[PDB]
């Protein structure tokens, strides 16, 4: 199950970086809609953390060794972080969360694919559930942004 | 008691159509304010459904036969429905909810008058409670829309 | 594109809206021994039906679709037929209507599952699978009440 | 005076109604016991609510509520019979319906008198209780295969 | 007879509820705001015993008193007309009197069911007697007195 | 006091002052029964604030403009305030609360009549509910004080 | 205290078999009343399981070794099991539960007497509590079946 | 305001007026973001009332006599009230709330300083806790206004 | 669906025996770690009971006849039971739970495969969910025992 | 009921000292298992305090005068106390709790017997309930220690 | 942190005695007001016990050894205990509670001062929080008794 | 680090790294005690994250710009991360948590010190509350490890 293990660990790194990006958005946010979207980032972060732990502990359950240092997370994630900036607009912050979420949905589709191909149905379901929820968020964030989900 | 029964049945039809219209607004909404107004439609729908069930079971209690098919709801409602359209602005969507709620408040006043006249105080009270909260919603929606309630 | 996955989701929106109306009718027009139990049971079924409806509609939206959202659309697209409310229907005839509504929904959900499986829409596939599971369980229980096997 | 009187009438009738419901609850036998036995508890609790609220309204209005079994029995227009296990479920439910029809008519009377005297507070207490009792009458009659026939 | 004492209790608990309700309603004087809702706790507890003991009697094949006529004729408690001029201390003194009668009745219930080998019924009277006696201590304590069981 | 708007706004002022009086009682109370009456004042104050907000927002809903400054509250209220005094007995504090509540119930009656006369049943219902509870409190308070409610 | 130990272990076997029988009734039930009685079986099963664990752990506490395999349960129980059959009427199902419960109350009576005579008052109480509730159930079950409890 | 007692009483007056100002904003608010900011005012008001009560009770506890009439509040407070106005923008509404909060945070700093100087550590902590939370609100409000907290 | 039905019924038998074994472990456990592992056994039992009822009622739902007697469970189960023994160490006790869980996870895989081939996706999901949770427990139990999960 | 009274009072003093010993164990505990047993001592302590207050209040109810000073507790208790010592192992700490419990269970038996002889049935059930729970704890502590309960 | 450690331990002793005195007041109380003040002694005892555990565990944390036997409590406490006496009036009982509380607040001031001088700010805040609450209780008790707090 | 803002950011970095190490301990833990200590890591991580968020917020509130990327956390933190290793004993894992907490306690003392010196009492409080709880955890972890807290 080497490829299911590799994608789980990929998600551990990516989700760790995604959490950090969401926390940055939470902190640096400024503009009309702050009061709604600032605590909304805690909800997204909590949900991201749930996926992270579950996917890491599935990796552990399968005999793997999850990345578990900030260096491992940062080096292995395909997500890129920039310095915090208070002058990013609300719309831009929401569009970055959408970018991250589209990335995660694509990653989860890959985890779904590989786990299916390896016959790892438990892992497959974990990815599917995460994908479901993330794609729903993309619809909502896009809607706020006056756009179709464009999945 | 023939008219109290009639107006309660009218309310069953109109509430069923108002539910559907609220559901459309909930689903087709796009633009800034989505994250607050999308779940708000669920609260409004649940409140509408509560009136619908209480007025219908009052009608039953009084010996009446509630409308209970979509054809009945559609044909007897004075509310008109259009196809859902994502390009309707948030402010236009809220304007639509306000016009539905104005209609309902007026319908509930007719219900109050009719049942008051017949001495059906229980029905009278159903209408008064429903009118009270709908009018408060009208104030709030109009305030969001930068307007006086204009009841 | 997921053309048929989207189509079956919207089919479900239509049928669930009509299913909801039928369960409400049963709820209101019910008379006979067993009323005190089956009348609020209809509220539980309605709420579950409403849950699938909202979730299937919002999956369709998520996918770039446009859900049916008027009574006219629900009526004309649903395969479920409605009749006028009638208080002289027996309890066991009411429960039998509910069973036939549920058999239809279970079959629709099966169609949703197969169609989404084939197009590789696994999220949609799981929504249908969960809904089918529950509907089929209620069929067992309703049928038991009616002194019958589930006969899926 | 009349609002006060009808409040006290309800105190007595609701006390006897509670007794009858408790009897139905205890002596019930037959298919449907397991649903209807605890149902009598919900009805009793609701009846006790009206009883205390109407009695306390009477106190608030300067009255003196009936507060002995003797007063309840001889002021109430509801008749009690000895407990009897032979009564069918449908008959037990029919007896509850009959008691509820009485309470609903009495609450209408309370509504009328209080409306005439301008005691809108008492007026609402009667309306709220009546609404709920009539709803029960529908459900009870439905179980019995019947229209509410208010 | 366990069955007889259970039915006596049904009658007396019915009358005791009426008396507590009377105290709840007619109470006036300093302490009303604490003692008025306290009567609700007592009545709820009294009604708990009433139902428990009645349905034990049904369980044993008995026929509980289920009419005010039966309650009033069989009960050994007496009722008087409600009176707003009764003092807070008098009202509470009346509550103690009722509770003392109840505990003694539950004592009799305990003895009789014990002699009869009916341990379930026995246990019902024991739990009830325990709480009533605790209440007697507290009421008496408020009244400046020892419980004097 | 020609109309419902007027009496609602009167309530707004009187309830504000009633709130302030109850707080005074709560703070300056001394003597046997403090442990029970002190927190009871909190209950009364929260109930009062409840009416205050309901009535103000009914007035807003009707298109009026609620008093919303202390000057407005204090000048338009017909209740009189005095300096906090620790040497007022418990019985005196309770008597003063009774006085406030008697005033409030009377005002709510005037509110009921004015709304009844102009067919504003929503407002009418608001006054009726508030009057019911206030009158119940007078009974209980009077009972503590060894008195009939004497409405 | 060998008798109390012996009866606690009997009850362990019998409660285990009683649970199985209730679970069969739960599964195989068909007919009007199913919707009430099917979940009612869960309540009974939970209560039986509470007795089982309590009685078992009292036996452990006393220095005994409770029956703890299906073979021990099945061979030591005096209750007899039959193949699940869907065609049994609801009435027959409830009659069967009554038979089981009568057996248990009688067993609990034996437990009460045996424990009383050894002066094991804790075991005594355990049987008394269990017996009280089972006899209450016999009444209700017999009431549904149109009969007196006939204890 | 030379001592802990004096600043605590100054706090009582200012908090009373702050409360009235927040209620005005709550009532008179119109514009996009109403549905979020209107109930937010209730949260602020409840927090404010919590400080009002604790500081007043602390004063009582220290042997002082709290201001407890509208006249005392309005005269002693350094906050100015103006007539309610429905044509104030949300941005303007939130800017006023910010002005009030900066005033309270400054007053709480004074109470902190004075109490530390007196060695009244209990009073000191009350001012510190209240200041902490108010400064946090300033950050959030400012961020909604697209600005740094600028304490 | 003959094979799905067969494997569901196998699960009913095996889960019934597994519950019995877990209960033995719960009862007979001695050694350091009791206070933790004794209630943990209750958790595992509740979970095992949940699969048992759900798999049995999926079988009923599919037109099957679940095993529903202790004799059917003992004879159909591939799990073997032995007399309770206080002298088994905690390590031995947890190792035994691990063996049981590995057995169940493998039966659930069989269940998953057979339902997959037959196109019974509802049953397939029931096995997959049960398998996931059991594998997770095997990881934790194994971790307690100082080992990799070694699925 | 002189001896019933006496033994209740013995229990007040002994439960007082037992509470103190358990608090010492709670505080001075060191070693593997701390994280479980440290909070467990709080559960035991709360349970011990429950019996203490219950038995004291029963004594008061019977016309007695509970020991209510530490002098009285110390002099009357048969339990002995020593200075806290962090160097005691976890296993000896738990053996010490067991000895306290064996004592209390013996005392509760004495209370049972005495109250039984005087026909104080209420006091009798109080000791029985308490004895049942303590003996259960003895089984559990003993199991942790790898021992039979040896009552 | 010698002085901080010493004063924490003095609190352990005095708080242990305070709890005993309150329990005495709880049990022996008689007179009008019993029904309010009897349960109020529970609230006080719970709060006292919370300080006792916190201060003891702060001392353990700091490397000290808490008093943990009744002899240590009784010999180290400055609080004096007398035999329970039902003839003490309610107002005398409350007066005794006031005196204990006055003693505890002064002890907590000493605690504050000593920890502040030593730079043990964690211990410092512990004393401050406890002091705040005790002084509030003093105001309330004094109020009941018709007096100023007179801190 | 030379002001409160500087130490707040240092805390953001260190808490981020502390969270990562705790998550590693949580994941890679094997040994007797796993079932207790694995979820206890979750409690420590929630708490650490509470500090991270409020310290970051406080920095934002003060006009600062928190580290908000993994690169920034990793490079600014003085904690070192090593690759996850299943072979580390439970006791070694616990000792690692203790080392981390000792570091955080020292950091928080530095934060307390710096903020006190600047007169930033709000920040000071934040650090003091955090230090308190971490030191208590150090006591408990050390107790598990059979050691004095050795602060
Ligand atoms: Ca648009
Ligand atoms: Ca059949
Ligand atoms: Ca090992
Ligand atoms: Ca050691
Ligand atoms: Ca005295
Ligand atoms: Cl799209
Ligand atoms: Cl828009
Ligand atoms: Cl009719
Ligand atoms: Cl049948
Ligand atoms: Cl071992
Ligand atoms: Cu985890
Ligand atoms: Cu309904
Ligand atoms: Cu939705
Ligand atoms: Cu009442
Ligand atoms: Cu009952
Ligand atoms: Cu408001
Ligand atoms: Cu157990
Ligand atoms: Cu206060
Ligand atoms: Cu089941
Ligand atoms: Cu106590
Ligand atoms: Cu502790
Ligand atoms: Cu945050």
From Swiss-Prot, chains A, B, F, G, H, I, J, K, L:
GO terms for cellular component: cytoplasm. Keywords: Cytoplasm, Iron, Iron storage, Metal-binding, Oxidoreductase. GO terms for biological process: intracellular iron ion homeostasis. Its main location: cytoplasm. Changing residue 125 to A: No major effects. Changing residue 70 to F: In strain: 854. Changing residue 26 to A: Decreases the iron incorporation considerably. Changing residue 57 to D: Decreases the iron incorporation considerably. CDD domains: DPS (cd01043). It catalyses: 2 Fe(2+) + H2O2 + 2 H(+) = 2 Fe(3+) + 2 H2O. The keyword ATP-binding does not apply. Changing residue 83 to P: In strain: 6407, 825, 849, BA 70/12 and KU5. Changing residue 150 to G: In strain: KU5. The keyword Cytoplasm applies. Fe cation 1 binds at residues 26, 53, 57. It is found in: Cytoplasm. Changing residue 82 to A: In strain: KU5. Protects DNA from oxidative damage by sequestering intracellular Fe(2+) ion and storing it in the form of Fe(3+) oxyhydroxide mineral. One hydrogen peroxide oxidizes two Fe(2+) ions, which prevents hydroxyl radical production by the Fenton reaction. It binds and incorporates Fe(2+) iron. Is responsible for hydrogen peroxide resistance. Does not bind DNA. 12 di-nuclear ferroxidase centers are located at the interfaces between subunits related by 2-fold symmetry axes. PANTHER family: GENERAL STRESS PROTEIN 20U. This is DNA protection during starvation protein. The gene is dps.
Curated annotation (Swiss-Prot), chain C:
GO terms for molecular function: ferric iron binding; oxidoreductase activity. It is found in: Cytoplasm. GO terms for biological process: intracellular iron ion homeostasis. Belongs to the Dps family. Changing residue 96 to V: In strain: 849 and BA 70/12. The gene is dps. 12 di-nuclear ferroxidase centers are located at the interfaces between subunits related by 2-fold symmetry axes. Changing residue 90 to M: In strain: 6407 and 825. CDD domains: DPS. The keyword Oxidoreductase applies. Its EC number is 1.16.-.-. Changing residue 71 to F: In strain: 854. Changing residue 22 to L: In strain: 849. It holds the Pfam family Ferritin. Fe cation 1 binds at residues 27, 54, 58. This is DNA protection during starvation protein. Protects DNA from oxidative damage by sequestering intracellular Fe(2+) ion and storing it in the form of Fe(3+) oxyhydroxide mineral. One hydrogen peroxide oxidizes two Fe(2+) ions, which prevents hydroxyl radical production by the Fenton reaction. It binds and incorporates Fe(2+) iron. Is responsible for hydrogen peroxide resistance. Does not bind DNA. The keyword Oxidoreductase applies. Its main location: cytoplasm. Gene3D superfamilies: 1.20.1260.10. It comes from Streptococcus suis. Fe cation 2 binds at residue 58.
